[PDB]
Amino acid sequence: AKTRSSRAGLQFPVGRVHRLLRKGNYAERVGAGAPVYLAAVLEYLTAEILE
DNA sequence: TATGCCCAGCATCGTTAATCGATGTATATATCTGACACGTGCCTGGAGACTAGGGAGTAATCCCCTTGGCGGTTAAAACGCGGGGGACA
Hints:
part of a larger assembly, 1 chains, DNA-binding, motor protein
């Protein structure tokens, strides 16, 4: 698969959330599966609420 | 001439049948709006690939801090008793 989201099996945007973690000054280095983890998390929450 | 008798004459009641119209019920067609999927076009904000560097991992040593044990006084917790004054109706 090309799309990252799909390599991690998800609907949430892997790379759009990565950049948002660099345009928010939150820190000097951005982690590699953080982004995903985080995307996926919210994903659940949304669901949880949206369910 | 007046009084019972013959011959029409429309409205009284009821019943039958045809007709215009309303109500109920399909049945295939022509709008209405609200789309969600696709292709149109374009931006680049992500992906992809490579590099370089310094953070963070780990490992090896140190030594400070935290836990422990103990026993003596000495205040504190514990108890009760009693009755007043605040809660509650």
